[PDB]
Amino acid sequence: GRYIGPVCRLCRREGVKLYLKGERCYSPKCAMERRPYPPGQHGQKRARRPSDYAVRLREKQKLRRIYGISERQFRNLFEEASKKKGVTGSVFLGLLESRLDNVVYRLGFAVSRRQARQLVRHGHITVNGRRVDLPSYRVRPGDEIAVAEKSRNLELIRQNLEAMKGRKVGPWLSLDVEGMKGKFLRLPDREDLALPVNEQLVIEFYSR
Amino acid sequence: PTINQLVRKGREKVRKKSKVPALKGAPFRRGVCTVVRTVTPKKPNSALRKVAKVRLTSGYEVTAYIPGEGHNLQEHSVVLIRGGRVKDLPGVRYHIVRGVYDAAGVKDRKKSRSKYGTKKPKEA
Amino acid sequence: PKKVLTGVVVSDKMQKTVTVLVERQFPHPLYGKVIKRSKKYLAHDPEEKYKLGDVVEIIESRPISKRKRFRVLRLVESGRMDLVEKYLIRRQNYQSLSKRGGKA
Amino acid sequence: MLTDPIADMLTRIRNATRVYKESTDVPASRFKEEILRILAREGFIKGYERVDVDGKPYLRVYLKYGPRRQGPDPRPEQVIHHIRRISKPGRRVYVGVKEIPRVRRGLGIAILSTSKGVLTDREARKLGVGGELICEVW
Amino acid sequence: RNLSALKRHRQSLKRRLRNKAKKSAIKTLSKKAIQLAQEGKAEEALKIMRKAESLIDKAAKGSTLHKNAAARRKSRLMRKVRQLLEAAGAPLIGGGLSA
Amino acid sequence: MVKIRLARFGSKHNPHYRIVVTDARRKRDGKYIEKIGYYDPRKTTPDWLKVDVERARYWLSVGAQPTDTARRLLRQAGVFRQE
RNA sequence: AUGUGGACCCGCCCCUUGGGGUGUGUCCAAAGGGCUUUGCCCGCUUCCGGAUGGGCCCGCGUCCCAUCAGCUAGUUGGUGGGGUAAUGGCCCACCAAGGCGACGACGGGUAGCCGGUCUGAGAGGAUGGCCGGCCACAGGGGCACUGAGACACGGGCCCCACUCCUACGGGAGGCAGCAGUUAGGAAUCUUCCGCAAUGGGCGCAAGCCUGACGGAGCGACGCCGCUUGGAGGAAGAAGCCCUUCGGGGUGUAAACUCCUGAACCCGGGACGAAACCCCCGACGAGGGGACUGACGGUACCGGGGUAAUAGCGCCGGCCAACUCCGUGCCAGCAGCCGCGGUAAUACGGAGGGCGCGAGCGUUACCCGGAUUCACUGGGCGUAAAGGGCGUGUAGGCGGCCUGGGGCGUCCCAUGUGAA
Ligand SMILES: [Mg+2]
Ligand SMILES: [Mg+2]
Ligand SMILES: [Mg+2]
Ligand SMILES: [Mg+2]
Ligand SMILES: [Mg+2]
Ligand SMILES: [Mg+2]
Ligand SMILES: [Mg+2]
Ligand SMILES: [Mg+2]
Ligand SMILES: [Mg+2]
Ligand SMILES: [Mg+2]
Ligand SMILES: [Mg+2]
Ligand SMILES: [Mg+2]
Ligand SMILES: [Mg+2]
Ligand SMILES: [Mg+2]
Ligand SMILES: [Mg+2]
Ligand SMILES: [Mg+2]
Ligand SMILES: [Mg+2]
Ligand SMILES: [Mg+2]
Ligand SMILES: [Mg+2]
Ligand SMILES: [Mg+2]
Ligand SMILES: [Mg+2]
Ligand SMILES: [Mg+2]
Ligand SMILES: [Mg+2]
Ligand SMILES: [Mg+2]
Ligand SMILES: [Mg+2]
Ligand SMILES: [Mg+2]
Numbered sequence A: 001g002r003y004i005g006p007v008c009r010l011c012r013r014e015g016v017k018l019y020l021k022g023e024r025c026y027s028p029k030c031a032m033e034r035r036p037y038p039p040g041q042h043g044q045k046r047a048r049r050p051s052d053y054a055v056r057l058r059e060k061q062k063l064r065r066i067y068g069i070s071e072r073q074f075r076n077l078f079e080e081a082s083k084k085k086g087v088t089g090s091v092f093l094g095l096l097e098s099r100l101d102n103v104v105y106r107l108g109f110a111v112s113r114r115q116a117r118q119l120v121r122h123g124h125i126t127v128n129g130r131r132v133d134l135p136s137y138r139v140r141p142g143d144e145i146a147v148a149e150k151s152r153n154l155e156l157i158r159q160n161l162e163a164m165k166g167r168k169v170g171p172w173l174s175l176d177v178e179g180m181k182g183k184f185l186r187l188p189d190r191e192d193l194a195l196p197v198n199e200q201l202v203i204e205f206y207s208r
Numbered sequence B: 001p002t003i004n005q006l007v008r009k010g011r012e013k014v015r016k017k018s019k020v021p022a023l024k025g026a027p028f029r030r031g032v033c034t035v036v037r038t039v040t041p042k043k044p045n046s047a048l049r050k051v052a053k054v055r056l057t058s059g060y061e062v063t064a065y066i067p068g069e070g071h072n073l074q075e076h077s078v079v080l081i082r083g084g085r086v087k088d089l090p091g092v093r094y095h096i097v098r099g100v101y102d103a104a105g106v107k108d109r110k111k112s113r114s115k116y117g118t119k120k121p122k123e124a
Numbered sequence C: 001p002k003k004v005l006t007g008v009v010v011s012d013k014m015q016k017t018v019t020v021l022v023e024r025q026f027p028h029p030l031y032g033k034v035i036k037r038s039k040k041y042l043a044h045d046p047e048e049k050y051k052l053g054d055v056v057e058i059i060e061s062r063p064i065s066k067r068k069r070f071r072v073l074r075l076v077e078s079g080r081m082d083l084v085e086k087y088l089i090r091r092q093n094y095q096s097l098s099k100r101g102g103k104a
Numbered sequence D: 001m002l003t004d005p006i007a008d009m010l011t012r013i014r015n016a017t018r019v020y021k022e023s024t025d026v027p028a029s030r031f032k033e034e035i036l037r038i039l040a041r042e043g044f045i046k047g048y049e050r051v052d053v054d055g056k057p058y059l060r061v062y063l064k065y066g067p068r069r070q071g072p073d074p075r076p077e078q079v080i081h082h083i084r085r086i087s088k089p090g091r092r093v094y095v096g097v098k099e100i101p102r103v104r105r106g107l108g109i110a111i112l113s114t115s116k117g118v119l120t121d122r123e124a125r126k127l128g129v130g131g132e133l134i135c136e137v138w
Numbered sequence E: 001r002n003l004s005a006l007k008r009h010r011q012s013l014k015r016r017l018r019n020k021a022k023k024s025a026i027k028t029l030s031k032k033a034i035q036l037a038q039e040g041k042a043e044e045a046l047k048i049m050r051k052a053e054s055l056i057d058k059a060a061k062g063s064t065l066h067k068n069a070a071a072r073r074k075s076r077l078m079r080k081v082r083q084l085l086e087a088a089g090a091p092l093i094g095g096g097l098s099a
Numbered sequence F: 001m002v003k004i005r006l007a008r009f010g011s012k013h014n015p016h017y018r019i020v021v022t023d024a025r026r027k028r029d030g031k032y033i034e035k036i037g038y039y040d041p042r043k044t045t046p047d048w049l050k051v052d053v054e055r056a057r058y059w060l061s062v063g064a065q066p067t068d069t070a071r072r073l074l075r076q077a078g079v080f081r082q083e
Numbered sequence G: 001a002u003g004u005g006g007a008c009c010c011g012c013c014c015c016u017u018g019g020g021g022u023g024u025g026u027c028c029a030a031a032g033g034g035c036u037u038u039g040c041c042c043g044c045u046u047c048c049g050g051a052u053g054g055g056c057c058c059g060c061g062u063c064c065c066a067u068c069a070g071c072u073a074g075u076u077g078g079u080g081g082g083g084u085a086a087u088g089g090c091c092c093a094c095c096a097a098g099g100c101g102a103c104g105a106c107g108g109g110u111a112g113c114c115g116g117u118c119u120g121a122g123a124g125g126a127u128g129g130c131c132g133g134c135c136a137c138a139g140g141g142g143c144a145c146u147g148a149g150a151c152a153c154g155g156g157c158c159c160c161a162c163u164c165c166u167a168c169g170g171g172a173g174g175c176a177g178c179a180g181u182u183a184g185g186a187a188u189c190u191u192c193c194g195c196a197a198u199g200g201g202c203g204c205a206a207g208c209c210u211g212a213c214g215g216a217g218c219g220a221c222g223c224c225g226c227u228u229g230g231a232g233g234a235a236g237a238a239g240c241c242c243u244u245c246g247g248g249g250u251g252u253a254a255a256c257u258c259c260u261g262a263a264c265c266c267g268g269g270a271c272g273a274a275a276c277c278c279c280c281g282a283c284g285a286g287g288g289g290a291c292u293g294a295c296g297g298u299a300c301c302g303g304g305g306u307a308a309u310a311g312c313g314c315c316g317g318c319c320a321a322c323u324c325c326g327u328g329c330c331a332g333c334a335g336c337c338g339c340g341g342u343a344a345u346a347c348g349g350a351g352g353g354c355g356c357g358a359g360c361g362u363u364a365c366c367c368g369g370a371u372u373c374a375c376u377g378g379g380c381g382u383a384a385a386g387g388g389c390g391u392g393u394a395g396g397c398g399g400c401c402u403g404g405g406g407c408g409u410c411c412c413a414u415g416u417g418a419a
């Protein structure tokens, strides 16, 4: 699956600006920019008061599409954050942020998570030295995520990591631009993430 | 009831009455068609519904709805059965599986195709 | 530890054997209430010594016959036919409970 | 005959407070006393005394109520919202110390009888004993 | 076909017979001893009880008896012999018995 | 008789045995008498052989009867100190 | 024959069920083989002890029907005897006349039981498939032999049923072992490799045997990981959407802008395997390279490299998603309520949308929601539910005070609760 289709139609249905096109979503043509109505031939008509289901459903899809993930993998992560000790709503977000495909995107090796995903699969990313090619591999803390040696001279990286000069990264990552090797210091707290998402709903959605 | 009464008598549990003796509690039964009659509906419906009496390998003789537009069920066509109550014909509590054995799957159907057992149209 | 029960002799009508009645109160698995419940043991009495009425200690023994696996250890208190009468009337009820009537 | 005298007392009290009696007379027993002793100490009554009534021994029980309230129905909040006989004759209820329940997250109590005497929930757990569980009160 | 552990069958038969005879010798001697005691012929009854003891203990050297099975058989024997003698006998040769 | 041997407990292509006292008539992977150690023949971990060496010598003392492999492993942990 | 010793009858002491000691009497032992030969190896005999395995007995627990209420002749107990490794009516002769049952005996129905498994907030409900433990069976029914152990799946005998041989008298069989065929059925795999690993049987060993096992094969049957990368318009021989041959949507979504490189090609290439054995040292000495890989040239590492499968259900309410045309109580839909009678978001198509995605639906069955058998946790004036009324048997239940006991109840320690 991986969805893998027209991403900006999902920017639009959920209603909030979404970074799936990673690069372009910053230009005045994110389609959410100056066309912010849903897809379809009812895109622009007046929408009635959604059921509580709707509300929870959408807030969940909103979250799942951010990280681009099959519901299979997603619900597995969620049950695991319930079973787990600690406020279960936000243990979720920490697990979701601990995904390698995502940690690569956070460190601006890639412009989209999607791009970052295909970057891992093609063995361009290392972890503690060794190669890893699983988008779902879980980064623990202390782990040093490098760019592949042979991939060091590749186009997209040369470009992408150069534009990473200047930029800051969340206070749980420690990217080093010289030798392209960030470090995963800490599981991110809820205030760290500026996700346009109300996970309380997300919990409540599986609370059915 | 008193505790003592409960200790003496107990509660009594419930029994499942199954609305499908397709026997074995099997999920499908094979059957040989007897009649391919037509039947009228009740309460507030009117039409001519395609039903079939079927002789079962479970050794049963039950009527069974033939879903879909056109069918090809002769006096002796063999056929598969699944559970399914037709709300309108009373005493019809099974469906014929369109697409298996002698029952051709509905032709020219583009929409809900896995029911009605029709192959992917050759639109390639 | 060979099990040791305590009970009431309710029968002396056997050769070197005495039926002992052992009562056991336990609380009910689902309904919580304590329920009395009982069982008859045939016990070995090698000297036709124990008489109908007394209360004896019964002990787990090497078998002595078909359904006779206990010997009579010591005696607790002497006579008390109340227990037997209780056990007697209980039996007498059965005389009814059939097709007609009987003794209540 | 009066089958469960303890239950009767708890009721007798429940019944008296709903019509806001000053005090109520319950037939005396060493046991009903050791309950009121707790009921009193945990602040649910003003206390009890051993009045004689046509020669036979009772226990006058002085009940507490909240302050006079306002709007329609000025009647005061009860201090005994709730009082329930739990172990009843012919369904006796015993708890181990591990099984002693938390009543009202502890804004209420549970009187219970132990071989260390009659105690509250907190009293018993501190003392590490279970017993027959007489009643809830919150 | 022909699993050549039907050889076990051949042997089983061969043995069956060895046991079978060993036992009949005991049964016929033990009987004879008892029936001799029950006549007060004591010297003759012990001279023969003693044979029967041996055969028994011997029987139990191979697999024909072994065990407390032989012990049993001896216990049943000497006990019976003494009683039929104690109906007026006075254990003459007093071979196998200790009075 | 009672033996000391290896009972297989790994995964396909991923063997781990448990060094086991058991009656020889038993299933290989069935009910045993006592576990007394384990073996990771692939040494995927720095701890790939471990023997309760006191206990090993106990069972040996009353006629436990090691497989030739089990004895290797036992020897290595220095059960019988051949010194 | 020798009697270390052990068995047996009678005694003697301790013990207490047949545990241990002791005395006279009686009875009971044995096997040889190999040598790198007079001293080593494997054996043999009796006894005591350990370890492992097992027999038997007992308490408690273990589904449904009372439209099954009475049951029982070895039946219950006894004395004696047979039998066993051993208790026992297990069996036998004789004697007593008992034993069981509403706390469900007798009968009938169903079923291997458990560790666990699914469900559930829990109490509970449901279940016993993989794996592990126990029990029972080996075409059906009986039986003993052999033996430490069997009443013995690939041992024996007899009877029955079926199949094959038959010179017609008589003989041969037994996949519920691996694989395989056939039938039944909605439905369930290869007549594959290997003795390398673990395990077992025999052998001093070398070895041998092992469809135990370790592996491979088939099947989205289940779980987990993974790919299909993604930046552009729209002429109907019966087939591109939305106000009458008309107004926007599909949608940044492309058959072509770079970038990466599943498949596929080439090269290296394993762990699992060190013991058994030989050698020094004493036939277990830190020496054995003595040798051993089915899986398999697979996994894994490196070099080359192509833009490279998408489906299925759904869109009236419950329930996330609406428009056009066809149809006109017809064709049909439907889990429930319900939709279709000419303007149908419910039928059939189309565009568009929603959910999931190597899957998606349907059927079937279990728990759930169901506090709808209610212990937690329900009810019965009128909704279903007080017996037509009494008497009282069994049972359930029991005022105040004191003392003993400690059965219920509570507490501490400990043993078990394997994997
Ligand atoms: Mg042979
Ligand atoms: Mg001799
Ligand atoms: Mg069965
Ligand atoms: Mg429930
Ligand atoms: Mg068969
Ligand atoms: Mg048979
Ligand atoms: Mg043998
Ligand atoms: Mg034998
Ligand atoms: Mg058998
Ligand atoms: Mg066979
Ligand atoms: Mg087979
Ligand atoms: Mg078939
Ligand atoms: Mg297979
Ligand atoms: Mg081997
Ligand atoms: Mg296998
Ligand atoms: Mg190696
Ligand atoms: Mg070898
Ligand atoms: Mg809706
Ligand atoms: Mg439909
Ligand atoms: Mg219309
Ligand atoms: Mg429609
Ligand atoms: Mg619908
Ligand atoms: Mg998958
Ligand atoms: Mg329920
Ligand atoms: Mg209730
Ligand atoms: Mg109700």
Ligand SMILES: [Mg+2]
Pocket: none
């Ligand atoms: Mg009425």
Ligand SMILES: [Mg+2]
Pocket: none
């Ligand atoms: Mg009524």
Ligand SMILES: [Mg+2]
Pocket: none
């Ligand atoms: Mg009335």
Ligand SMILES: [Mg+2]
Pocket: none
């Ligand atoms: Mg009464």
Ligand SMILES: [Mg+2]
Pocket: none
């Ligand atoms: Mg009473």
Ligand SMILES: [Mg+2]
Pocket: G398
């Ligand atoms: Mg009382």
Ligand SMILES: [Mg+2]
Pocket: G406
């Ligand atoms: Mg007590």
Ligand SMILES: [Mg+2]
Pocket: none
């Ligand atoms: Mg415990």
Ligand SMILES: [Zn+2]
Pocket: A008, A011, A018, A019, A020, A021, A025, A030, A031, A032
């Ligand atoms: Zn966007």
